[PDB]
Every structure is written in structure tokens, then in C-alpha cells.
Design a protein around this ligand. Structure first.
Ligand SMILES: Cc1cc2nc3c(=O)[nH]c(=O)nc-3n(C[C@H](O)[C@H](O)[C@H](O)COP(=O)(O)OP(=O)(O)OC[C@H]3O[C@@H](n4cnc5c(N)ncnc54)[C@H](O)[C@@H]3O)c2cc1C
Length: 463
């Protein structure tokens, strides 16, 4: 038994953003975050990226990474002294953010306004937030298998997982990566580079005809496969796993089409499933279409319960009911999540943005609704020295691209791809086009039926 006014569940990108949001509005509010992880809230994007590109080993320790412009940066959101302890909190009377790492909420009670930690202790809340994110999908073929194979397989998302992998890559001869996602691909390049240094084999395999095939059009997905390949990666499309066994001391991957890949370690990056274990005890709605907790436009589930981030199935007027997995989204909705908690009764209006880096040399931004199967227009040109994340970082000063681009709304190598529906732009992927995301947002938000989409591209430096 004990009490805190602002309590937030899951200690991630969304929880920390709300934590900052509430503080801003109610200065002197007492905030407590509970987190499964033993780590203090940190951003995630460096884990599949810039953290792999440092030649300093004690950076596997400190997690102080280098950007493409080469300036240090801590992974954790703020230094730890910024927090206040969890016991000292009620007596701080001036408020702060306290962090209960190593604990887990296992019972919610909406009428009773209290959670239950795994160790059985209880905490009463006045205002609660569920920002639990998600657990990466396993691959049912790996589930039927023994604990021996299960062990030789990681599911990349945490820091525990970043260190574990990077460790293995200095140990074995061949790491296979399952998943044609951005993560998958980022990973595969991250490994691909290290490979150019140890000789290790990096295989990437996935059911799609190409990298990010479910998103990008064939011709750009295909181009992307080449870059993955060039970074030293034996890449295997149209791959569908049948079984994973152990023979010759190694891991054997059998494919539905007969092929057989033999390897040392599997890292699987094939989706996220949203953490909704709390919904059963408390009794909130989940979405069977999109997954995760059903909230309204004010990201609200029931009185004194808001949800945000990757677990957030929210309504969005200029689009409809949704659930997205952006970092940008987690920052914003979290913020909004804390804004609403302190009686701000406000809608969600942001257009969340995604981004991916494959190395310092190639970057994709995306926003809106992007699917390969929708009608597509893409305009393309030869890229200039600026058209890559290295420059975009040297300029803006940051590596987290949703920062460089703000959340406002104003021989080929770069271009923009419009995703249409009825001569009207509904999604956008930008390839190596930087600091033009507000123009991306504007176009989508307006919704005009351009009888020529070239002109629209003249807006991204494309001539
Ligand atoms: C390697 C990697 C890279 C990415 N790169 C990019 C990128 O480059 N660009 C981009 O736009 N997006 C990227 N994303 C996606 C983006 O980072 C996520 O959508 C966002 O960070 C989600 O944050 P969240 O806090 O909502 O979820 P999380 O960050 O998962 O926070 C959830 C936390 O809640 C805890 N938790 C869950 N259930 C309970 C419980 N019952 N009790 C207590 N604690 C609980 C978990 O332990 C976890 O620590 C990336 C994701 C990963 C994994």
C-alpha cells in the first residue's frame, strides 16, 4: 500500500514524454514511472543504428554513442540525477519524476484506482497512463522448437538485446537475420559492416520479394536489396521458414521452397505485438483489427486512464481509427497524454513520422499511409552531397530525425514517392530528401487532386 498522483506504466519513450509534459503544466506534481526494464528511460533508434558504428568498445558499456557528425550522445533521455528516488518522492513536496525500475504492473483496477506490482505491493493513483509499448513477435517455427534453438535466438528491442547480439557477433562465424522490415534491414547492415571487419557471414532472409517490400514499391525495394548486399550481406528473398533444428552443432534453417541455410545465430525482426496483458484484469477495450487499447482522440480509455505509444489504438479524425509505431508518435502522444491528464481535454492532431537509416549514406523518411499495394507515383533525381543523413545530421545537429524535421506543417539517389488514392496523396516516402517533412505533412493534410505530381516534387529539390 502507497500513493502517487501521477503514475505511468511502462518506462519508455511515451512515459518519459508524458513525465516531462505533466511537470511542465503542473510544476510540483509528483510523478512515478514503473518499468519492467532495469534501465532508465532511453530512446531506441540508436540500437539498430549508430551504436553499431563506433570503434570504441567501452561504448558497449557507457551507451554514449556517436552521431554521423561524430558528437557523443547518451542513449538515456536525461542523466539519472534528473530523477528523484521512488521512496523520497512523497516527501519532496515540489514534485519530480521517480523511477521504479525492475518492477511490473500485473493487475489494474479502474474502479478501485490502483495497480498491483508483481511483488504484490499496491499503489493508488489519481491519474494513470498505460504506455507499455510492445513485445517483438516470435516465429511459430522457432516456438515449436527446443530450448536449445530458442536460446540461440534473440528478439531485438532492448539494451539487453543490443549488447547480447553485438557480443555474439565478436564470437561466431555466421549470424542470420529474419525479417525484411526496416529494423531487420538496419540490423543486417549493422552486422554487414562489422562483417567487413571480422569476416563473419551475414545472411538476411524474408518472405517478401525484397527488403521493405510491404512498404516500398518494387523498384526502390529492389534497389534497397542491392545496398544491403553491397554492405556485405548474402540476402535471400522469397524465404519462408519451415523448421529450425540443430545439426553439426550449428543451427539449420529449412525453407518451405526446399533451400537450406546453415548458421550460428538467429536474430528475428518480424513485427511487434502490443502489450495488453493489463487489459484483462482492469477491463478496457483492445482493438482486434489494429491491436492495442481502444482510446478516443484525447488518447483516453476510461476516466483517469489514458494510453499512449505503440499500445495506443486511437481515433484520428483526418484519417480514422489507428495504431502506429513511430518514435515521433511516442514522443507526441506521450506529451499529449500528459497534457490531457492535467485537464487539457485536447484532441490528437499530429501527423506522426517514421524514419530509417541504413548507414550514414542512405535514409528513408515516411509519413501517412504507405503500402506497396496502393497506386504509386515516384519522382527521382541524382542526389547531391547533402542528400543523406550524414549531412542532415551535420546541419540540424541531431541524429533523431523527427527532431531535425520538427513536428510542424508548412546514378539515381534521391526522390519522393507519393502514395495516391483518387488522384489525392494519402501517403509519402522520401528517399534521401531531408528537412522537407513539414511540406510532406502539408500536402497530405490538404488533399488536393493534382493533375500533375511532378510540380509537387519540385518542392523537395527535384529537377
Ligand atoms: C531497435 C528499434 C528501433 C527503432 N528505430 C526507430 C526509428 O529509427 N524511427 C522511428 O520512427 N521509430 C523507430 N522505432 C520505433 C519506436 O522507437 C517505438 O515505436 C517507440 O520507441 C515506442 O515507445 P513506447 O514507449 O510506446 O514503447 P516502449 O519503448 O516499448 O516502452 C514500453 C516499456 O513498458 C514496459 N512494460 C510493458 N508492460 C509492462 C507492465 N505490465 N508493467 C511494467 N512495465 C511494462 C516494457 O518493459 C518497456 O520497457 C524503433 C524501435 C526499435 C525496437
Amino acid at each position: 500500500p502507497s500513493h502517487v498522483p501521477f503514475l505511468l506504466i511502462g518506462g519508455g519513450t511515451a512515459a518519459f514524454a508524458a513525465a516531462r509534459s505533466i511537470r511542465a503544466r503542473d510544476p510540483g506534481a509528483r510523478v512515478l514511472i514503473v518499468s519492467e526494464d532495469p534501465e532508465l528511460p532511453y530512446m531506441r533508434p540508436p540500437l539498430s543504428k549508430e551504436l553499431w558504428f563506433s570503434d570504441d568498445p567501452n561504448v558497449t558499456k557507457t551507451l554514449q554513442f556517436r552521431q554521423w557528425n561524430g558528437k557523443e550522445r547518451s542513449i538515456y533521455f536525461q542523466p539519472p540525477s534528473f530523477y528523484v528516488s521512488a521512496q523520497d518522492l512523497p516527501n519532496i513536496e515540489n514534485g519530480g519524476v521517480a523511477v521504479l525500475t525492475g518492477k511490473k504492473v500485473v493487475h489494474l483496477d479502474v474502479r478501485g484506482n490502483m495497480v498491483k506490482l508483481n511483488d504484490g505491493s499496491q499503489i493508488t493513483f489519481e491519474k494513470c497512463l498505460i504506455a507499455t509499448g510492445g513485445t517483438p513477435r516470435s516465429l511459430s517455427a522457432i516456438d515449436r522448437a527446443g530450448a536449445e534453438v530458442k536460446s540461440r535466438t534473440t528478439l531485438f528491442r532492448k539494451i539487453g538485446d543490443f549488447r547480447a547480439l553485438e557480443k555474439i557477433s565478436r564470437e561466431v562465424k555466421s549470424i542470420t537475420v529474419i525479417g525484411g522490415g526496416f529494423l531487420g534491414s538496419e540490423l543486417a547492415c549493422a552486422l554487414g559492416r562489422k562483417s567487413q571487419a571480422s569476416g563473419i557471414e551475414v545472411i538476411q532472409l524474408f518472405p517478401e520479394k525484397g527488403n521493405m517490400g510491404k512498404i516500398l514499391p518494387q523498384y526502390l525495394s529492389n534497389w534497397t536489396m542491392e545496398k544491403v548486399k553491397r554492405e556485405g550481406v548474402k540476402v535471400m528473398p522469397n524465404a519462408i521458414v519451415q523448421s529450425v533444428g540443430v545439426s553439426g552443432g550449428r543451427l539449420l534453417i529449412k525453407l518451405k521452397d526446399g533451400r537450406k541455410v546453415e548458421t550460428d545465430h538467429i536474430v528475428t525482426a518480424v513485427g511487434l505485438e502490443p502489450n495488453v496483458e493489463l487489459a484483462k484484469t482492469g477491463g478496457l477495450e483492445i482493438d482486434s483489427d489494429f491491436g492495442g487499447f481502444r482510446v478516443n482522440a484525447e488518447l483516453q480509455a476510461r476516466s483517469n486512464i489514458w494510453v499512449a505509444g505503440d499500445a495506443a489504438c486511437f481515433y484520428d479524425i483526418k484519417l480514422g481509427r489507428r495504431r502506429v509505431e513511430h518514435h515521433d508518435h511516442a514522443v507526441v502522444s506521450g506529451r499529449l497524454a500528459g497534457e490531457n491528464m492535467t485537464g487539457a481535454a485536447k484532441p490528437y492532431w499530429h501527423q506522426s513520422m517514421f524514419w530509417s537509416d541504413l548507414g550514414p549514406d542512405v535514409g528513408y523518411e515516411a509519413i501517412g499511409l504507405v503500402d506497396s499495394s496502393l497506386p504509386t507515383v515516384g519522382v527521382f533525381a541524382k542526389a547531391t552531397a547533402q542528400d543523406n543523413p550524414k549531412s542532415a545530421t551535420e546541419q540540424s545537429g541531431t541524429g533523431i530525425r523527427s527532431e531535425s524535421e520538427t513536428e510542424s506543417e508548412a546514378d539515381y539517389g534521391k526522390g519522393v514517392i507519393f502514395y495516391l488514392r483518387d488522384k489525392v496523396v494519402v501517403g509519402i516516402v522520401l528517399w534521401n530528401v531531408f528537412n522537407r517533412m513539414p511540406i510532406a505533412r502539408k500536402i497530405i493534410k490538404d488533399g488536393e487532386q493534382h493533375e500533375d505530381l511532378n510540380e509537387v516534387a519540385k518542392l523537395f529539390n527535384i529537377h
